[PDB]
Amino acid sequence: LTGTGVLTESNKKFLPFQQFGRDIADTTDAVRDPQTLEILDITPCSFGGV
Amino acid sequence: YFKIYSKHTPINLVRDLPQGFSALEPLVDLPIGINITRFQTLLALHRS
Numbered sequence: 001l002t003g004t005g006v007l008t009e010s011n012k013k014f015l016p017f018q019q020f021g022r023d024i025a026d027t028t029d030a031v032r033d034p035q036t037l038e039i040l041d042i043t044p045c046s047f048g049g050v
Numbered sequence: 051y052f053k054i055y056s057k058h059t060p061i062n063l064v065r066d067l068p069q070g071f072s073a074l075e076p077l078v079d080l081p082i083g084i085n086i087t088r089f090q091t092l093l094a095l096h097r098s
């Protein structure tokens with residue numbers, strides 16, 4: 001799964017089976033990292049109009 | 051893939067199914083790759 005974003009701590013109580021999370025666009029918004037099984041929230045990097 | 055979804059619920063109804071809502075969490079995602087068309091459940095006898 002490829003993508004760009006900032007990985008931050010989260011307070012979403014994922015169930016054991018649950019691995020990732022999806023937004024309305026179906027783009028991944030949270031992910032469970034392998035090896036350490038922790039849940040990292042994925043927030044898209046800041047952008048806007050110059 | 052043979053998916054087993056399971057849920058355990060504490061109930062106190064005597065005869066029929068209880069009326070309520072309980073979502074089944076996925077328990078086992080099983081890699082078999084075989085044809086299944088017929089099944090049979092296993093019970094346990096009591097001997098005296």
Ligand SMILES: *[C@@H]1O[C@H](CO)[C@@H](O)[C@H](O)[C@H]1NC(C)=O
Nearest residue numbers: 019032033034035036037038
């Ligand atoms: C390796 O990953 C598995 C699950 O993917 C995990 O249970 C295990 O703790 C990991 N080991 C190390 C050394 O990170």
Ligand SMILES: *[C@@H]1O[C@H](CO)[C@@H](O)[C@H](O)[C@H]1NC(C)=O
Nearest residue numbers: 051083084085086087088089
């Ligand atoms: C499974 O077996 C039945 C007959 O036992 C057959 O009709 C069916 O096509 C088979 N399916 C597969 C995917 O092999």
